[PDB]
Design a protein around this ligand. Structure first.
Ligand code: HEM
Ligand code: CYN
Length: 142
């Protein structure tokens, strides 16, 4: 279950982080990489083997941030549309699975995102529920 209140909170807070994504996106990745080394490992190719505390201001980081943001924005705009959600989720999972990434790792990411969102007026509880509904749709395909 997702209440109307949780959905409104997720949409408003995302709007705010979205306007600041130019600088916050990279901060989000750094926290993620700091919390899970296994996650950073999967980006070795994109980063060309560079060490973790060295990727923040790279052109690849900027690009990766914009990619992350475009999918999250689509999920957010369709919270009352399970059908739409399902389809976006299918592609996302097929793509990530093919890289050897686990359901557990995806889950890890959503947790760091929920905490991160607190800085933008986000209710951690509302982000956590949104993450569970999406995981319910991703898992069967992982
Ligand atoms: C859970 C929230 C996530 C979102 C919204 C997200 C979103 C995306 C999107 C939109 C793309 C580009 C389309 C594609 O190539 O699939 C992508 C690519 C990628 N993702 Fe994610 N992803 C997430 C989680 C992860 C995690 C946890 C990892 C690592 C364990 C990961 C690793 C990658 C890599 C390696 C690529 C390809 C980068 C390249 O172009 O070389 N993603 N992700
Ligand atoms: C990773 N997006």
């Amino acid at each position: 279950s997702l209440s109307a209140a949780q959905k409104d909170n997720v949409t408003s807070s995302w709007a705010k982080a979205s306007a600041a994504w130019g600088t916050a996106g990279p901060e989000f990745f750094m926290a993620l990489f700091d919390a899970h080394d296994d996650v950073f490992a999967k980006f070795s190719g994109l980063f060309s083997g560079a060490a973790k505390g060295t990727v923040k201001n790279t052109p690849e980081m900027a690009a990766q941030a914009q990619s992350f943001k475009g999918l999250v924005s689509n999920w957010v705009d369709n919270l009352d549309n399970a059908g739409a959600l399902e389809g976006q989720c299918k592609t996302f999972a097929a793509n990530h699975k093919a890289r050897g990434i686990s359901a557990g790792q995806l889950e890890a990411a959503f947790k760091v995102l929920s905490g991160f969102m607190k800085s933008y007026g986000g209710d951690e509880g509302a982000w956590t529920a949104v993450a569970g509904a999406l995981m319910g749709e991703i898992e069967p395909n992982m």
